[PDB]
Amino acid sequence: PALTKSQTDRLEVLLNPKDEISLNSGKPFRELESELLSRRKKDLQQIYAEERENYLGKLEREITRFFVDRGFLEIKSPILIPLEYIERMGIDNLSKQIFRVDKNFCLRPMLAPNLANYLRKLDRALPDPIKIFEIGPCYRKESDGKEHLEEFTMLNFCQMGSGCTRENLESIITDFLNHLGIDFKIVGDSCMVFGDTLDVMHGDLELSSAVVGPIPLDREWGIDKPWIGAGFGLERLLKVKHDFKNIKRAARSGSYYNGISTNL
Amino acid sequence: PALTKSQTDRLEVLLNPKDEISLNSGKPFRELESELLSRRKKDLQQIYAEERENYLGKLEREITRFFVDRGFLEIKSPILIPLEYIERMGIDNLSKQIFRVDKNFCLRPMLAPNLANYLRKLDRALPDPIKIFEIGPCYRKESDGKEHLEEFTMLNFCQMGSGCTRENLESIITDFLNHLGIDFKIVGDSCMVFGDTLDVMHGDLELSSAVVGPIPLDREWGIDKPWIGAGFGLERLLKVKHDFKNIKRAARSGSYYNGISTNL
Numbered sequence A, B: 001p002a003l004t005k006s007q008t009d010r011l012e013v014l015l016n017p018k019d020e021i022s023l024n025s026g027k028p029f030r031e032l033e034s035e036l037l038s039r040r041k042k043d044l045q046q047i048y049a050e051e052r053e054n055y056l057g058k059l060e061r062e063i064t065r066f067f068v069d070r071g072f073l074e075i076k077s078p079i080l081i082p083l084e085y086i087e088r089m090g091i092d093n094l095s096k097q098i099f100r101v102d103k104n105f106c107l108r109p110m111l112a113p114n115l116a117n118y119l120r121k122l123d124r125a126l127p128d129p130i131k132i133f134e135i136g137p138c139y140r141k142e143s144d145g146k147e148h149l150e151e152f153t154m155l156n157f158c159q160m161g162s163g164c165t166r167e168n169l170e171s172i173i174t175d176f177l178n179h180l181g182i183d184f185k186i187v188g189d190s191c192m193v194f195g196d197t198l199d200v201m202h203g204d205l206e207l208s209s210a211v212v213g214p215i216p217l218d219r220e221w222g223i224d225k226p227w228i229g230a231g232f233g234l235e236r237l238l239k240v241k242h243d244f245k246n247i248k249r250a251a252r253s254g255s256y257y258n259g260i261s262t263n264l
């Protein structure tokens, strides 16, 4: 007969983009579920036998090699940060998205404040230009949606000193996304923290916001040179690469492994 | 003359294990500081020119390759977890160490609960034995000490099914630490969560606690087979490898890069 909402939801959990299965063909739920369970067990068995790498971990390692090889220093900075960094970033109290931790701390919603501190400090020791990047967890309270996670993974690369032009920023973005095989376009947008941005779009999906400094916020962080930077969501990159319907397939999760349901 | 406490503290920040500099030789602070600042700038310039990899990131990648190559599946699970996982792990309220997040959540203090869930789920799809591991951030409130961080990085590997003997557990630990070049011994200890442990010691420094199941806690997590597992702190491994005096040299930080002060 007809599938209930609970039944369709279960089949959607077990369905993957490579499948060609109609959920509403009239085939009974029991047979659709059994077929998809067999395909997903086979998929996980193949990963276990032949690959064994996590998609988020593997992508982080691929991105790390790209930027290290192009002269950027790899940064690993705190995830648990002072709440004061939030007001100083100019987040007047979307401040409602912040996860607070025991009074004076929060989970970082972006990598920029820690990277600003590193640019300032490293400019006292390293030759021009200063090039650094970080990949790691960031946290925002979000409405339920197909493109948002409350725990996600950011890449932010940035440069300070010479070479900090719009054309060089766009060239790095182009080489990076060409390396990953992802088509894109650049559109102007704006945001409360940085002002005008160059948004990197794949269709209607925002992969990145990028910024050409200086901006007035620089003084609050001791930044006094030209700079460029861009932030990318790794789970959004994986969603494009693997054609996932929902970004949850790509997230840190106990519910999916490399986009395969773990409820088998 | 004589160095103040503030002056000695500044020189200790700038000193590295490879140096052979006496702080109390009678040389004036100004010359000791200038010498150490020049050495550390040179050190950071060399990293920027020739390596560019972060010690924590590089060690995570080295460990990941070791375990993937030995048949363990790489896991990346949530860092922000339900507070309920804490009581169910048998942490009666050292429960005082937990960082709480907005009422019903906390920062994970260990990887075991998420890995227990993965062992249970994967046993329905994968062949015996189930071998998995994770590396990532964990969080504990700690007293100030030379061997503790409030934000640290755990490795936990584990196995469920056949082969889950004390001798196989000790053999994996031995191959792993032999790969890293770190000498150790095994001593019995106990802990509130798991009961008897095999503690992996380098001198008086605990590198790991390891456990041979089953244990009574298994029922609360749906675990019903023999299992073995071990948890290691990556910053403690780096402290041994690089002979750091304080584990802070090894931590996620804005204050040190690969053990070199960023306050230059």
Ligand SMILES: Nc1ncnc2c1ncn2[C@@H]1O[C@H](COP(=O)(O)OP(=O)(O)OP(=O)(O)O)[C@@H](O)[C@H]1O
Pocket (backbone or CB within 6 Å): A110, A140, A142, A147, A148, A149, A150, A152, A153, A154, A191, A206, A207, A208, A209, A231, A232, A233, A234, A235, A236
């Ligand atoms: N909640 C989230 N989940 C997953 N990825 C995210 C999330 N928030 C931001 N990102 C990713 O981080 C990048 C940089 O963050 P930025 O602050 O520019 O996001 P944003 O402008 O708020 O994005 P959106 O408008 O889609 O909410 C984004 O372009 C996106 O790729």
Ligand SMILES: Nc1ncnc2c1ncn2[C@@H]1O[C@H](COP(=O)(O)OP(=O)(O)OP(=O)(O)O)[C@@H](O)[C@H]1O
Pocket (backbone or CB within 6 Å): B110, B140, B142, B147, B148, B149, B150, B152, B153, B154, B191, B206, B207, B208, B209, B231, B232, B233, B234, B235, B236
């Ligand atoms: N606060 C911390 N900072 C750095 N590493 C830690 C910390 N807590 C635990 N570890 C590392 O994680 C491993 C497994 O955690 P476990 O719960 O066994 O620690 P523990 O027994 O509390 O250690 P300790 O007795 O030194 O506090 C430890 O053997 C150690 O290598």
Ligand SMILES: N[C@@H](CCCCNC(=O)OC[C@@H]1[C@@H]2CCC#CCC[C@@H]21)C(=O)O
Pocket (backbone or CB within 6 Å): A110, A111, A112, A113, A115, A116, A119, A156, A157, A158, A191, A193, A194, A197, A209, A210, A211, A217, A218, A219, A221, A223, A227, A228, A229, A230, A231
């Ligand atoms: N997450 C962002 C992605 C954009 C990247 C911009 N930031 C950097 O690249 O790093 C340091 C520069 C400069 C220092 C003076 C200040 C300040 C804040 C940091 C900024 C978003 O569009 O939301």
Ligand SMILES: N[C@@H](CCCCNC(=O)OC[C@@H]1[C@@H]2CCC#CCC[C@@H]21)C(=O)O
Pocket (backbone or CB within 6 Å): B110, B111, B112, B113, B115, B116, B119, B156, B157, B158, B191, B193, B194, B197, B209, B210, B211, B217, B218, B219, B221, B223, B227, B228, B229, B230, B231
């Ligand atoms: N951090 C630890 C390191 C010891 C590792 C043991 N844990 C695992 O290896 O993983 C899953 C097994 C089994 C499931 C039934 C239960 C439960 C909790 C998880 C446990 C410490 O000694 O503090």
Ligand SMILES: [K+]
Pocket (backbone or CB within 6 Å): A015, A016, A017, A018, A019, A020, A021
């Ligand atoms: K499909």
Ligand SMILES: [K+]
Pocket (backbone or CB within 6 Å): A151, A251, A252, A253, B078
């Ligand atoms: K998550």
Ligand SMILES: [K+]
Pocket (backbone or CB within 6 Å): A249, A250, A251, A252, A253, A254, A256, A257, A258, A259, B076
């Ligand atoms: K996952």
Ligand SMILES: [K+]
Pocket (backbone or CB within 6 Å): B015, B016, B017, B018, B019, B020, B021
């Ligand atoms: K020394």
Ligand SMILES: [K+]
Pocket (backbone or CB within 6 Å): A078, B151, B251, B252, B253
């Ligand atoms: K830290």
Ligand SMILES: [K+]
Pocket (backbone or CB within 6 Å): A076, B249, B250, B251, B252, B253, B254, B256, B257, B258, B259
């Ligand atoms: K560091």
Ligand SMILES: [Mg+2]
Pocket (backbone or CB within 6 Å): none
């Ligand atoms: Mg947003």
Ligand SMILES: [Mg+2]
Pocket (backbone or CB within 6 Å): A206
């Ligand atoms: Mg946007």
Ligand SMILES: [Mg+2]
Pocket (backbone or CB within 6 Å): A191, A197, A199, A206, A208, A209
């Ligand atoms: Mg944006």
Ligand SMILES: [Mg+2]
Pocket (backbone or CB within 6 Å): none
């Ligand atoms: Mg302890």
Ligand SMILES: [Mg+2]
Pocket (backbone or CB within 6 Å): B206
């Ligand atoms: Mg102990």
Ligand SMILES: [Mg+2]
Pocket (backbone or CB within 6 Å): B191, B197, B199, B206, B208, B209
């Ligand atoms: Mg222990």
